[PDB]
Amino acid sequence: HTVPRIKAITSKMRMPKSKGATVLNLEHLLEYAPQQIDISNTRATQSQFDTWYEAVQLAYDIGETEMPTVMNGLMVWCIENGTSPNINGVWVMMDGDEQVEYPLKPIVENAKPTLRQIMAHFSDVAEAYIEMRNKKEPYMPRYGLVR
Amino acid sequence: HTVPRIKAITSKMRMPKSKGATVLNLEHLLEYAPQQIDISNTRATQSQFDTWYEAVQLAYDIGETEMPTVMNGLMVWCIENGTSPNINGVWVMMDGDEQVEYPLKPIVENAKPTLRQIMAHFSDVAEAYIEMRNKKEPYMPRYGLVR
Amino acid sequence: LLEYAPQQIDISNTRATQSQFDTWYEAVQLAYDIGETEMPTVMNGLMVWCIENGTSPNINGVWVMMDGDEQVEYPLKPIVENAKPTLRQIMAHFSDVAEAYIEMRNKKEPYMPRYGLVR
Amino acid sequence: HTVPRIKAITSKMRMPKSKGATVLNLEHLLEYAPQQIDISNTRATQSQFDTWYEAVQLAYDIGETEMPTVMNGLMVWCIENGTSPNINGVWVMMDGDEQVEYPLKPIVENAKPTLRQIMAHFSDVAEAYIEMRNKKEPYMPRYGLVR
Amino acid sequence: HTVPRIKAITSKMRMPKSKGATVLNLEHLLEYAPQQIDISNTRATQSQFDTWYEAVQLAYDIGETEMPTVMNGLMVWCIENGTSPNINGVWVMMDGDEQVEYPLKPIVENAKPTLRQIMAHFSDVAEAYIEMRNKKEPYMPRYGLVR
């Protein structure tokens, strides 16, 4: 009478075993549902990102409220330009009609494992930023996304 | 009258012979029916898997009940990412909204003949895990299965 | 010449010579250091292991035979080595038994091997 | 019926023989499983290390509880700098914001066969120390490890 | 009718001749089938090995039953380390958690033509010893085999 429903884990599926016991905790494996970007190696670890963030803030010698504005310009600068730039150089943020100079050594250095992975944390914001700008001008960046 | 039934081994089939005697024990060959994954070289040997399992547990210096939870995260981390990662790196397991860091040297090393073969022991569980997650989100991993 | 009617597998170079096969057989038995009655059971597992896997495996490795729910380890160096001219030709002696073994197993499960036959 | 199991030592393997008798005690050879770092010549012998340890402690004329703190600084000083320094010099340990001077003659001398081999006893601790520091700053030493 | 069988030595093969007579005793040449390791110069002669064996035993001044245990440790010490070590040094054998010191001068000296050739007598046992240890740990020696 009852229409059967199949389980996710059957009693026929071979679990990995070591010394006669299973090596996976299935009571918690089904519950364990992380996000695909939190456990991907294409993104720098949060410990590495916070290591980079306060290392750049201390190198630039700026406060905690001035720091987010720098990241706004650094994200946009990383949209037009690449994530493998010259370490002995500068990156520019606009203050209206006046360019503002920042050394590129504190940024390329202290970014582990790679600036690409550190900059990949801005990918969701970067995509939204381009689409907003693309709605008012033929904006297309030379070097892909911030990733 | 009787409808004949053909034997599996006829008296006309050439057995391998050495010094006049057959080299195969046919009395036990028909009974011998192993599983295709237990005698395949695409999977690491159980002796090698147990060698890897206690070598990782001892390197991480954790108990026997905490160990299965690590393998739950390591399997999922091996779904999104590959089985040939940087040995000088870390792999991440989520504890809710906080990443947990584990060295990737005890994992890539001590896995013989290859991490792929060691990780291939999770293939049946890995396929079920994706299909369960794929039923609630467009989940697709960059690097295939755990194999 | 008219009387001379050999079998097509006894004079084919896709199969190792009987002198070479017996050279391989006692060379593997002596290397494994096992008796004459235990030896055929090893060949039963080695044939099946050569159905799922290939005949060009890593010489620095092992091949597995099942003892129920326990794997049994055998070095693959005495097998790949001492097999002349090639393990393929040495293993080709099991082709008739290998075909029958698969068809028997295929009658109870969707059994299909990655690496063809034992040949 | 029985699936054979191969012995580690077969009755066909040529043992080294002198005057008709074997030169290896096989009853104890299988049991004899030392650690690869206890019988390696890249590490100074324990007799040599203890010879160096009390020779440095006596030369510095310090107690037994003050001595371990000196080795903490000497290990770190041997991470940034090499293990072949000038014997007519000093090595520095920090006491906060004040450098502390120690002669380098009692260290380079009395270390047999080489300071490198004597300092190689700290390799496991040295690797852990760098990885701990590398998690909070881009720490990389000029002269490799303490080895 | 008879299918011919070819001889190993035909009546057309040029034998080496001196003064009209052959220089090889073919009646015994076919029977003469030595082992490839007994007549190879990569291995020290048995006369040289026994010369080395009792020369080391007499130098160490130990009995005939204590001697095989020393060779067990010396073989393993020659797996991790090389066969060209400093003659003015020591080699270590483990007694559990206590190193045991042996001079390396009686070993490097009295070994003719070379310690390598003298130590090559342990090659078969050395290969088996590593494979046994490699089944329980990622054991790999710096300096190849005992050869």
UniProtKB/TrEMBL annotation, chain C:
Transmembrane residue ranges: none
Location relative to the cell: Virion
Top-level taxonomic group: Viruses
Function comment: Involved in aphid transmission, cell-to-cell and systemis movement, encapsidation of the viral RNA and in the regulation of viral RNA amplification.
Family assignment from sequence similarity: Belongs to the potyviridae genome polyprotein family.
The protein's name: Genome polyprotein
Organism of derivation: Potato virus Y
Range covered out of full length: 70 to 188 of 267
